[PDB]
Amino acid sequence: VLVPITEASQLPQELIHGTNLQSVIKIIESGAISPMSRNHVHLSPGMRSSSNVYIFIDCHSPLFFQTLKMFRSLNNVYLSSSIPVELIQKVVVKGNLKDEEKLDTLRRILHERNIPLEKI
Numbered sequence: 153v154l155v156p157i158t159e160a161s162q163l164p165q166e167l168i169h170g171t172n173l174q175s176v177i178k179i180i181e182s183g184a185i186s187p188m189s190r191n192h193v194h195l196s197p198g199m200r201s202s203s204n205v206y207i208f209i210d211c212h213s214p215l216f217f218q219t220l221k222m223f224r225s226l227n228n229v230y231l232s233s234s235i236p237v238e239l240i241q242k243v244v245v246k247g248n249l250k251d252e253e254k255l256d257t258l259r260r261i262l263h264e265r266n267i268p269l270e271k272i
């Protein structure tokens with residue numbers, strides 16, 4: 153069962169969507185993190201073990217609850233409506249030597265949208 157999240161005071165300190173480098177490029181280019189198979193986008197308070205990309209949602213955006221409908225399951229996982237990339241606070245990628253070309257792409261699209269990228 154899910155309960156509603158309607159006030160910023162209920163948002164954790166960070167809200168993270170774990171993914172890989174190929175999805176985060178598709179995410180930025182299509183303009184939104186979409187629920188896909190599931191009915192909601194799954195977010196971890198701050199994931200698949202193979203997730204090397206971490207998308208931080210800006211929990212302090214004045215437009216947060218005008219853009220997302222937010223829920224929380226009893227085991228503390230946050231479920232949301234489509235998240236526009238413009239609500240993305242920061243994208244953190246664990247670098248792999250094999251993905252150096254994709255990261256240059258990610259660097260450009262994120263700058264074009266003024267989303268900061270951090271490579272660890």
Ligand SMILES: NC(=O)c1ccc[n+]([C@@H]2O[C@H](COP(=O)([O-])OP(=O)(O)OC[C@H]3O[C@@H](n4cnc5c(N)ncnc54)[C@H](O)[C@@H]3O)[C@@H](O)[C@H]2O)c1
Pocket residue numbers: 168169170171172175178179182183184185186187188189190193194195196199200229230
């Ligand atoms: N992703 C997280 O950080 C997170 C948070 C908490 C728990 N979980 C757990 O993980 C499972 C959910 O799987 P999931 O979160 O990987 O999602 P999912 O299994 O439904 O797979 C959807 C995939 O599509 C990607 N995607 C989203 N928007 C896209 C777009 N516009 N273009 C291309 N790709 C896009 C997502 O990043 C994700 O990799 C559940 O068991 C859930 O409890 C996930």
